[PDB]
Amino acid sequence: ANRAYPYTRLRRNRRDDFSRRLVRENVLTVDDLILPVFVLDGVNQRESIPSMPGVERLSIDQLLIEAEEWVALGIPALALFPVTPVEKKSLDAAEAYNPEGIAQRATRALRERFPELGIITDVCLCEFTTHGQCGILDDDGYVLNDVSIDVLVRQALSHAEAGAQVVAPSDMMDGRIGAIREALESAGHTNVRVMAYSAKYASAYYGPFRDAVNKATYQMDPANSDEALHEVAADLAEGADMVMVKPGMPYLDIVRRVKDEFRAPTFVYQVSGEYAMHMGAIQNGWLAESVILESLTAFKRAGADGILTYFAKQAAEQLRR
Amino acid sequence: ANRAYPYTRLRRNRRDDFSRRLVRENVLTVDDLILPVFVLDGVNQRESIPSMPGVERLSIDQLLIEAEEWVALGIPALALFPVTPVEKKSLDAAEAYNPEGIAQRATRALRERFPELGIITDVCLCEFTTHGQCGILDDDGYVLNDVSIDVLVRQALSHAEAGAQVVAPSDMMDGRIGAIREALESAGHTNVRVMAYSAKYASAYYGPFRDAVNKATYQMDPANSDEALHEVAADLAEGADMVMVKPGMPYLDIVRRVKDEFRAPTFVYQVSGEYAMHMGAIQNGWLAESVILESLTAFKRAGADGILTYFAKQAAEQLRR
Amino acid sequence: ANRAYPYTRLRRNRRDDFSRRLVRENVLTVDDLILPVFVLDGVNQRESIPSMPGVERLSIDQLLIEAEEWVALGIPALALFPVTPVEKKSLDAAEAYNPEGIAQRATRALRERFPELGIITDVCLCEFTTHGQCGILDDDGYVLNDVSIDVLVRQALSHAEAGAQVVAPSDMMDGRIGAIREALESAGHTNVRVMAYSAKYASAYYGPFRDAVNKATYQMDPANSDEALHEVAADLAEGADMVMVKPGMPYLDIVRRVKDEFRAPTFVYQVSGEYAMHMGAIQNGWLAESVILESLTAFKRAGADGILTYFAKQAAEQLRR
Amino acid sequence: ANRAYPYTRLRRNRRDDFSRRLVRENVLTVDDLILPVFVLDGVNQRESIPSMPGVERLSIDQLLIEAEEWVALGIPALALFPVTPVEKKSLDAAEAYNPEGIAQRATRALRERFPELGIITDVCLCEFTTHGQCGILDDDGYVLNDVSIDVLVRQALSHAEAGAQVVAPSDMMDGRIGAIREALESAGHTNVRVMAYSAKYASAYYGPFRDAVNKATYQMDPANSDEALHEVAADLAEGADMVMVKPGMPYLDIVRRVKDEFRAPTFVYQVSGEYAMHMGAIQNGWLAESVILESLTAFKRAGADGILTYFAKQAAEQLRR
Amino acid sequence: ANRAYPYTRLRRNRRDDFSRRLVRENVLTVDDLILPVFVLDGVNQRESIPSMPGVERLSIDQLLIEAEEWVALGIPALALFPVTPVEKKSLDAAEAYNPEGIAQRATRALRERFPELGIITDVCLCEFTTHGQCGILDDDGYVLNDVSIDVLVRQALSHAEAGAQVVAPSDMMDGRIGAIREALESAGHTNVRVMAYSAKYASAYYGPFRDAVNKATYQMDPANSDEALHEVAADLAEGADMVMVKPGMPYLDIVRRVKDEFRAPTFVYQVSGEYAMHMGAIQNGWLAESVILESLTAFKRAGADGILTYFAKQAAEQLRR
Amino acid sequence: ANRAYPYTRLRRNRRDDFSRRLVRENVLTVDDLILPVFVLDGVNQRESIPSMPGVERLSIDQLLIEAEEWVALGIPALALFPVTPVEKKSLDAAEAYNPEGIAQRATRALRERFPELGIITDVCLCEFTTHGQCGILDDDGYVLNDVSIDVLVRQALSHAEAGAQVVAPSDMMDGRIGAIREALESAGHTNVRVMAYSAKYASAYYGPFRDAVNKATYQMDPANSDEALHEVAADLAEGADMVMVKPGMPYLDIVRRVKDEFRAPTFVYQVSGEYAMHMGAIQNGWLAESVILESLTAFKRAGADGILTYFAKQAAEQLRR
Ligand SMILES: [K+]
Ligand SMILES: [K+]
Ligand SMILES: [K+]
Ligand SMILES: [K+]
Ligand SMILES: [K+]
Ligand SMILES: [K+]
Ligand SMILES: [Mg+2]
Ligand SMILES: [Mg+2]
Ligand SMILES: [Mg+2]
Ligand SMILES: [Mg+2]
Ligand SMILES: [Mg+2]
Ligand SMILES: [Mg+2]
Ligand SMILES: [Zn+2]
Ligand SMILES: [Zn+2]
Ligand SMILES: [Zn+2]
Ligand SMILES: [Zn+2]
Ligand SMILES: [Zn+2]
Ligand SMILES: [Zn+2]
């Protein structure tokens, strides 16, 4: 309000650590972190991912072991991403709802072993189709909206039955949130949260995910911002408990507008390519390790309530010290 | 959007600790706490304050002893309140700017031993006038505005000279922020912060401070909210680095409006009477100790960047667990 | 608008009582007060509450006597809180809807004796369950949402049948307002108001209520503010005539945001622990009695239309003089 | 939110007096009333005003008699309007600043007898010029702006010297607020309030004031609303402590906009013609007496902090019941 | 934007008629006027109304004659108010929907004679009940909401059948707009407009209407402003084509807020008592005739699209000249 | 609110002329029109402008003849554009401030014959420089800002001296409004209005003006909208009484934003090319004459207070019917 130099010098609050601490507008805590993890079939399996240095795909027995540390660090939740054996992929994506699928078995195992740990399952067909699209194809190769929802609903129900506290539809079909919510309510899964991937973009930043585990007709055009508000509005009306933006850093303006417009629990995914970029630069000595906390603090400043990040264990370790 | 039961059940996020953690909107940290402390003239002395159970007036040697632990707990700053010997009070309030006054001695001692600890001095005449009004009286007993500013300016300079990083005018004279800022700038105290008590009310909640250590013509009417915004706007234009509301909990609506309107560093004082009423109830077994963190979290939720609170040590200890 | 010292001196309107009166932004009146009262079974019963000095639990005959003064003072309404005999508590909470329960008998007695006095009954199961939770438990000890609503509906209907003009659901089940409204409308209770406890927090300030008469899965996290707006929006859509924030003082920022966002009749509960805090401090001589009116004026300034307060009789007496 | 019949029936809160009381948004109190009064030159004289039934011009002795009752009723302030003897009018308006003029004598007399009663003097030349324009005329009959300010400044100082707490420039010269403020500050009248007639319209509702006691080049076009906001902004920047709209009821939309835009102390004048049309209709039996309180409540609802009204005594009497 | 004297002198645009005309923000035209008219049974009947000087009650033959002038003046619409013979009043208000009632006969006669003239009929039971309440009473003397709607629906249909282009429900029952709209749509009266009396206050300004032709449980409390927005929102959702505030001048702040919030066609009624007030003062010589156009211009400035005014013929005459 | 078909049918208000009239949001009146006119040096001369069919350059005697009818039609003001004889142009533009230049002679002649008619002179050098740029060129052919202001100031004073009520700087030099205002104030031309061409674009729509009578370094880029708000803010702060956008129809969005942002008197120029394209199409039989009123109504709807238009006579004639 009519602030002018030299009466106002914004450097004064910057002069000392104590005053920078008092005026600091945002903080990252371990309550903000969600750890995504790639889950293998089998026993005693651990696979390094070349394009995501430091991240490993884990069979369920190994996941249970590593989760001991994650829980001890106070990380609130995991987001599970199964790595489907290629032979179990099909046109109808039926493995998506197999009670003995990787995601379902992993969920039951973690829910028994660590009852307070949040498990967020991935509701999508892309790791179950032979073609790798997020839904079922018609005879022109188009991803059918409503037919795909029918399969996503079965999948979500199977995750709820396995004990997941949160299902996270990452498919970008229109209307899927309401369809899934209706099915959960009808089946008695009253308190299963739905974390909608509301504004999920058709992005180049997904590169490394493929190595861990057309799209422009469902995923959003990177150019568009207003459209993300309409996407989130629909998902909230349809019953989502949380809404998500993906990717993350390249979309912090979207996080900001979404938080400002709806004042709802807003989440963001720091995707594989964001992780890879940062880690490559750190390893090369081009960026200091402090960039990890800075990247995560950005999400908080931009309005996120929680962050899906492959840095979650390291960040949690740094935060505790 | 159009969120409606049962598609929207706001209890889902409440169902488990992990989700409550993920969606929690505010957190209290040690970086938010400012510890006020009453300082005595002598050596190896403490006094218990009857109307503030658990709070002690401390001689400077005892202040340095207790500050070692405050610093270890990570408390960023102290607010010093001298307890002036009655023999040093006067109509002209000259003790306010004595280079060997309690505040100035305490400041030099703390700046030397704990160089990173913030020291916020109190710029006001009420502890230095025989009558205890915050400024100089005319012959009808009205508190003169501009004559009082002249004394306040000298006092503020004396604090800067003693090494205080922040001076906090608590007097509610009109225009004093700008006068003090000009004086600091002209004397080369470029980086001395001014924490304005901007919206300071004429309140019954100050009961116990008089024990620890006319008003309606300068302090604000408890009925008034819009007026607080005009007070803060003036102080920001006059060069304040931070602005404060006092009292605190009884005025959380004012905190909220002030933060929302100006988005400037906004502080709040949980005053003596607020401390006493909480502590009295805790000691009677009427409220759990958890009320302390609840009361301080309220300030964060209401938009405060920092909190002057007699519970700062107790809070810092609890937060360290 | 470009107001600057010394052209603008905000002390001028403060200089005299007459001008402070002319610019005073808010006023407390007896039209703003609701008196909560604890009601005992039996005849000629009066019980002091150690943790709420000055408040008595009253059998219905004694309540009728005391209500003579309350009505003569112009207090518009009472909020009734029965003290259920321990032997009448059960798993199914059936006493909640007993036409011969304390609340129902008290309502009929007051409606006959004082036809213009508002009676606000408490719709909740916590004073009727053996376990003291606000709803019915499942086999995991979780408070079931929709099953509890069924009982709350019967309770609300029983209160309407007893002649209550207002029912006030304090249970924090999702969707209960709409369920209760639907039931009242279907039964012909067209003009029975519903005063929703919309943003009711899981708070330490409830201590003394227990002596007068888990929760984090239904009552709100003190940290959360945006969430309160979503709570109130739902209750207004579901048909509430009034909406309430509880507790009070520690949540004045919430009152302010709720009034600003919805422009609906907004109420606030100055809870047992707030009363106890203030009264303890007054009795100890730490705060002047004037703090009572200041506390209540705060609620008006923050945007409340009415206040549930155990100070209502004393405040009404002070206001009349 | 999405409030819809029959879930929402806005008549429920209307059903009973107690609920209408609880939700009532505004109230009129005595603290809102300013009583205008026409003051004569002589001794033991009153005159009935034909076009304002029930209002009397009062000599100063009679003014002191009536003020005893105004003070007893708790009316905070009077607005004095002298009735200048024709022989004292002139082209230079010099009687405006005569230390023994009616206004100045009346002010001294009231300040001495009733020290707590606010006195608001009228700063304008229209009762002092032979032609009755509010400023000094040039040779073409245009009302000169800055030449008129010089006289207005002298008049305002004379009022301050006589002890008025508030001076109220009613002239609608550009820039006069700042000129008067500067003069007051430079003369040491630090605390004299300036109540600007900010949005004063060229209105037919002034009919009866001329009986009681060119204009379109200074007073505002009744058609214009946005222009009123610019007028008020200038007066606030120039140092006004209060701002006023005149006339009143015919301009309630302007009151509302002005309060909403500036959130400053906002006053309204229910002018002679508004009084006369109400009083005439009441006397003819065409409107009930209750219309008086209704008209004044309108001002409060529209956002006025205070009301200059010829009904102030009658209102205060009714409010005291 | 930083406008300051003397760079900005707001008197410059006021200096000459031409510039005042160029900047004039609002204009009144005959397209804004609706003429209310009281209609008698019988032939060759004309009755002066003592409390509304210049207004006559007219039998239908006389109405047709006078309407010649009104149409020639360009007045767009009449609002018809029948004066029901006392013997035709009843408990069931059945005369309200008599195809041979005054309003119905008058409507058919005017629709035939002047096909382009708008006819707005009055949907309410108060001129048809023996008791004069706007709806049907229950055995406690309360105006039943939904039972009254059933009769209002029959009335509205009868007006549509008679050829009215607009029906204007003035009853203040909850939900009546949607009920009437549903009935009109079901019956094929697709283009019959509904002009809701949305915010109709329980006012003293209605005095003279009674002579031309309890309420607090349906009509609004004069104190309330926010409530008017909720009233209008419901009426727009329920299908109103126009919304109305009544009374007029004493509620211009309400007109302003309603226009600003909803941007819908907004109408205002300058009621009998407003007409009487002004006319009495004009006749007495207390106000100039120019007050008529000023009063009407106020409504435009406040945001009204049209005005129901007993001044419509005189205003139209003045506008044309 | 939630307006939905078929409860809401927006065609109902469209059904009849009377209702379209009642809800019509904007109207054009004669008071909105400013007539631009090209003025020749000689006597008893007119010239037809090839690129503006129907518009004539007029010698001053012929201007006085045509103005009699313009005044009779009620047109409030003319904007004069001299057509400078080539022999009077120069690098220093000195003819701009000649007391016997065309503009000055025309102004004196019109002020004398038609004292109530507004005269708006054109403050710019483009009709006075040999090269036709709006300011003075440096040796590289850049239009110098502040050197050009000095000439513009002299020109503006010459217009004031000739009696113009309004001067309208059309030059788009930075800072010229304030410079001209200061000069007018210092010379005693207190009431001379300054109509700033604030947002004047570098447009192809000026084609025909050059026939009638580099630019991208001063006139605005057609692509830019936010920049127009900054231009207007500066001009208002510098003391403009009115602000203008030019061209007009191609910039109606700018009109709307400017009115909405500043709520100041906002004017628009329908330039030569807009006139020519409309008139050409009307003459070819491609558009009806009704397009003229439609184009001018657009300006009103977009928020203009007044319109400079070559159709002003034709419009005024049509509006008089
Ligand atoms: K902090
Ligand atoms: K979190
Ligand atoms: K007041
Ligand atoms: K109230
Ligand atoms: K105009
Ligand atoms: K109209
Ligand atoms: Mg979507
Ligand atoms: Mg201040
Ligand atoms: Mg709820
Ligand atoms: Mg002004
Ligand atoms: Mg309604
Ligand atoms: Mg410019
Ligand atoms: Zn997918
Ligand atoms: Zn002090
Ligand atoms: Zn409960
Ligand atoms: Zn005057
Ligand atoms: Zn009626
Ligand atoms: Zn030019």
Side-chain angles (χ1 to χ4, degrees), chain F residues 118-282:
Chain F
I119 307 297
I120 304 165
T121 56
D122 183 45
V123 165
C124 199
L125 315 179
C126 52
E127 198 48 31
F128 305 100
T129 55
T130 45
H131 43 78
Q133 297 293 322
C134 298
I136 304 300
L137 297 188
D138 70 11
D139 300 318
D140 311 318
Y142 179 67
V143 176
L144 292 162
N145 202 85
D146 297 351
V147 163
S148 296
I149 292 178
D150 297 331
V151 189
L152 297 163
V153 164
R154 295 188 76 174
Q155 172 177 46
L157 287 167
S158 72
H159 301 166
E161 282 162 11
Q165 306 103 316
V166 190
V167 304
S170 69
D171 55 286
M172 289 293 283
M173 305 297 89
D174 293 332
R176 90 283 205 191
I177 301 307
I180 291 168
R181 174 58 68 213
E182 280 167 17
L184 290 169
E185 281 289 313
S186 283
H189 297 294
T190 304
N191 293 136
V192 170
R193 284 116 285 178
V194 174
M195 181 178 280
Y197 287 67
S198 296
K200 184 177 167 164
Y201 290 85
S203 182
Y205 291 99
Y206 301 145
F209 189 87
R210 301 96 188 282
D211 305 289
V213 90
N214 111 95
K215 294 260 182 191
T217 72
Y218 48 107
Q219 295 173 351
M220 289 180 61
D221 186 337
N224 295 353
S225 180
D226 290 337
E227 187 182 14
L229 298 181
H230 293 281
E231 279 287 353
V232 170
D235 290 345
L236 287 170
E238 287 172 35
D241 307 286
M242 306 100 153
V243 296
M244 198 207 300
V245 177
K246 181 173 167 198
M249 179 165 284
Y251 295 91
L252 285 176
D253 57 307
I254 307 306
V255 179
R256 182 71 276 159
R257 291 192 79 194
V258 166
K259 175 45 75 156
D260 287 343
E261 193 69 39
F262 302 101
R263 315 223 177 258
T266 299
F267 293 74
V268 62
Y269 202 143
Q270 184 182 53
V271 302
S272 58
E274 293 175 68
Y275 173 88
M277 71 180 189
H278 284 85
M279 182 61 143
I282 290 164

Side-chain angles (χ1 to χ4, degrees), chain C residues 56-252:
Chain C
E56 291 178 291
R57 314 175 201 104
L58 301 174
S59 54
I60 292 169
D61 62 305
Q62 291 309 297
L63 175 73
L64 289 170
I65 287 159
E66 294 304 326
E68 290 183 15
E69 205 132 306
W70 304 330
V71 169
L73 288 163
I75 291 165
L78 316 180
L80 303 179
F81 297 98
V83 177
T84 298
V86 161
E87 64 279 7
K88 286 172 185 307
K89 298 182 180 192
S90 69
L91 273 193
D92 69 3
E95 185 68 8
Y97 51 80
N98 185 347
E100 298 301 321
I102 295 170
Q104 290 83 0
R105 291 182 347 250
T107 298
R108 290 192 297 267
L110 287 156
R111 293 296 290 115
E112 180 190 49
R113 178 67 178 84
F114 306 104
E116 293 289 313
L117 178 64
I119 305 295
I120 304 168
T121 59
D122 182 48
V123 170
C124 197
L125 312 183
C126 52
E127 245 319 82
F128 304 98
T129 53
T130 45
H131 46 71
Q133 303 296 321
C134 296
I136 303 302
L137 302 188
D138 72 14
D139 291 4
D140 305 314
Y142 177 72
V143 176
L144 288 163
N145 200 84
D146 293 354
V147 160
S148 296
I149 290 172
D150 295 336
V151 189
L152 296 166
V153 167
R154 295 185 72 177
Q155 179 180 36
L157 288 167
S158 80
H159 296 170
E161 290 165 16
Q165 304 100 318
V166 192
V167 303
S170 63
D171 56 288
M172 291 291 287
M173 301 296 92
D174 295 330
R176 90 285 206 191
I177 300 311
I180 290 167
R181 174 61 66 214
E182 279 168 354
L184 291 170
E185 285 287 317
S186 175
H189 295 297
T190 304
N191 291 311
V192 173
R193 284 117 283 180
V194 176
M195 179 180 283
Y197 289 64
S198 299
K200 179 175 175 174
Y201 288 86
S203 185
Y205 290 100
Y206 303 144
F209 191 84
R210 314 215 160 81
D211 317 346
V213 293
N214 70 314
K215 301 242 184 206
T217 71
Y218 46 110
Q219 296 174 354
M220 289 180 59
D221 182 343
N224 294 355
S225 178
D226 293 336
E227 186 183 10
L229 300 179
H230 296 278
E231 280 287 351
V232 167
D235 293 345
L236 288 171
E238 290 170 34
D241 308 285
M242 302 103 157
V243 295
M244 195 201 304
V245 180
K246 174 175 188 205
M249 193 132 307
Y251 299 86
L252 290 175

Side-chain angles (χ1 to χ4, degrees), chain A residues 172-176 197-198 231 234-235:
Chain A
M172 291 291 287
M173 301 296 92
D174 295 330
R176 90 285 206 191
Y197 289 64
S198 299
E231 280 287 351
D235 293 345

Side-chain angles (χ1 to χ4, degrees), chain B residues 16 26 250:
Chain B
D16 299 297
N26 288 281

